[PDB]
Amino acid sequence: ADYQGKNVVIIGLGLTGLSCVDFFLARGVTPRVMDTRMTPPGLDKLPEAVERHTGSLNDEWLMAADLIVASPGIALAHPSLSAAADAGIEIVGDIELFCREAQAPIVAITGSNGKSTVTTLVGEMAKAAGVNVGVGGNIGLPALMLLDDECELYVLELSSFQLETTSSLQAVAATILNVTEDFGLQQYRAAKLRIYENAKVCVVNADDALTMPIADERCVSFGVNMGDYHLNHQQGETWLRVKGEKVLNVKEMKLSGQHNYTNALAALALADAAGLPRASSLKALTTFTGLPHRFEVVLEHNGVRWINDSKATNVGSTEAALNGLHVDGTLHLLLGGDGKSADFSPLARYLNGDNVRLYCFGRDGAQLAALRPEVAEQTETMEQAMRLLAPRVQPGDMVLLSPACASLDQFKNFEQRGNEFARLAKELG
């Protein structure tokens, strides 16, 4: 709240640390700053009035501080911070400084997968409602840079390290989307579970027990077959259901696949919990086009929809895409890149019944192609397949780039593979 006259030191010269430096100068406080790296990226932007230390942690500076603002990350485990901690010196992170200062409600989101899409979705839901929403945190802009007296709602993506140094978060709605197998999960999960303390509503995953406040709160839940928000398949259609009532035929959304339907359900629940109008939140679900390379619809013309799912660099990812994949006509699935000797058999079950076409390429193209040589087709590069499927597509079709494999034998990173795909789709399309 008031930091005047406090000796404050910041650990971290990246954008978060710079954001904190700005935060204290704005309040008449010249903090000190350090970074283990010898040349941190941020050193270049510091006001000369602030003292800085690089290449290590200045212990003298830590031990003498009244407040230590640590940047989230493995740095939180550094023995120097722990001694300062053992000496009773207050340690907080930017999210903690943010919560003490925020004058609008916060929707807090954490998870091991999908967190970015969900956080973006809720933002989209806010915008569709005409609300001045600030979205960021562990993604986009550092929370402190969102502080604005005119902001009407904050949507933050929080990581485990951030939650570890946060204690005054009082989220209007909070969720741990999922806790997957990527220190010890017990401390990982305990970190994530603090997103629920003092949360007005808790949104949990009905299909992942680790996302639950061990109920101890009576939480709202989303899931595939069960929960307050869940999927329903009846009478040849799949619907999103809320408290038993149908609220949206999945077909009205642009994002398809189970994964995306649970994401939609989770954002819907958080949006409802935050008090946004249901109809404007539903509206956003029909217009959302996706984050870069994540079931991103780069182009929708001549009745065909072109989806860039490059991020899908493994069978599990491509499987989240296919399962529940809605396509009126034919799916021209683009499989490619280096699979690192992986079992594609799980994909096969999603490629039957005459309305499918594979266009395999890259290093392991032969193999995926084999996943069903019948409807397959093989090339060395992705641009071939593009020009090879373009004359074949007609209205109702979807062109999908869900590699199920890595990108290196011909691309810098999946962002290169996807950027191209978008480019090629521009003309090809």
Curated annotation (Swiss-Prot):
Cofactor(s) demanded: Mg(2+)
GO annotation, biological process: cell division; cell wall organization; peptidoglycan biosynthetic process; regulation of cell shape
Compartments reported by the entry: Cytoplasm
Domain of life: Bacteria
UniProt binding sites for ATP: G111, S112, N113, G114, K115, S116, T117
Catalytic activity: UDP-N-acetyl-alpha-D-muramoyl-L-alanine + D-glutamate + ATP = UDP-N-acetyl-alpha-D-muramoyl-L-alanyl-D-glutamate + ADP + phosphate + H(+)
Record keywords, A-Z: ATP-binding, Cell cycle, Cell division, Cell shape, Cell wall biogenesis/degradation, Cytoplasm, Ligase, Nucleotide-binding, Peptidoglycan synthesis
Enzyme Commission number(s): 6.3.2.9
Known pathway: Cell wall biogenesis; peptidoglycan biosynthesis
pH effects: Optimum pH is 9.0.
SUPFAM superfamilies: MurCD N-terminal domain, MurD-like peptide ligases, catalytic domain, MurD-like peptide ligases, peptide-binding domain
Family: Belongs to the MurCDEF family.
Described function: Cell wall formation. Catalyzes the addition of glutamate to the nucleotide precursor UDP-N-acetylmuramoyl-L-alanine (UMA).
Protein name: UDP-N-acetylmuramoylalanine--D-glutamate ligase
Lineage: Bacteria, Pseudomonadati, Pseudomonadota, Gammaproteobacteria, Enterobacterales
